[PDB]
Write a protein that binds this DNA or RNA. Sequence first.
DNA 1: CCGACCCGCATCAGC
DNA 2: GCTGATGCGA
DNA 3: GTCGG
Length: 326
Amino acid sequence: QETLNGGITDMLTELANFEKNVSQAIHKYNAYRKAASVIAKYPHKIKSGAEAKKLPGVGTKIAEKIDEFLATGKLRKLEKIRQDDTSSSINFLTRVSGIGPSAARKFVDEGIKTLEDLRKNEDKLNHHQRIGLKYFGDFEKRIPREEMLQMQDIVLNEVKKVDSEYIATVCGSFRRGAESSGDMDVLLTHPSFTSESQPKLLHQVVEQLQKVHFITDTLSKGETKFMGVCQLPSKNDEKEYPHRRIDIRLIPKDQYYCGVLYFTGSDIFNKNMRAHALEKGFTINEYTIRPLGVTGVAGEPLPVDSEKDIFDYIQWKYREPKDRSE
DNA sequence: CCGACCCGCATCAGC
DNA sequence: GCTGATGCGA
DNA sequence: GTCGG
Ligand code: NA
Ligand code: NA
Ligand code: NA
């Protein structure tokens, strides 16, 4: 029920997960999600599939499943997937970070189906999957904004202790003011790092955060992207905080604010802004805004030294992150 | 009728 | 050893 | 799965 249509939204999200994890049909997965997002925003209790079909992203098949769900309170197809041992095991194992549909299938094919089975077969797991297994429960917890604020202060301070010239921004829905987050997404830059130009810039920051024991584990790390695990320090007497997922991305200074814009979102806000930028003769991606010639040929990137600059180019009043829900 | 639907890093396949 | 494909994660 | 060239 939720905000009028949670049963339908829950059903669509479950169908999405089966498409992604078991059938390996990622476009169907995203079709079901989009339909769930549209419906979640529809401010009426839907009464028929035909009503739902009017909404963009709902077609004949989702309408039919909505009719069945309304008439009966259930979907047959979803009921049989639920009791299928292979589908439910594949679905479950993909909850481990680093285990996607392919690894989940091979594990289930070899009788590895549960966390206990994984705990028993560690040598069959790569490094990422072992870390995802170790923190299985913590990684499914949301992060309250209160903790994200603290996490933000540590990153910004540690970054400044390495080099005062680093610029670091915590983006994601947290930057839009969200009351919880699923992970922490940090965008980093330094004036010595441009698209046309000093080494170890990402490494130095990751190392600092490891030294003070904020970053506890590494999932992947190269010269421009780090994915890992972090944890707030304990009060010495209170319960330990859960381990959290954190990504850090090093971006060229001249592309920084286009990245900050992109990764702050929302996704709906980004599609809308790109769509408006096109109808003004501009193309914006996660790195640049460039003017379009009369035949549609993208010209050279325009200078960008703030988020505002981007809004100025396309004749749009600046909108605070708080106001970028769409 | 039928193709679109948006890359960094770890690891495998193959050479 | 290397190059390119694949899986994965957001 | 849904949309649209
Ligand atoms: Na529709
Ligand atoms: Na997974
Ligand atoms: Na998953």
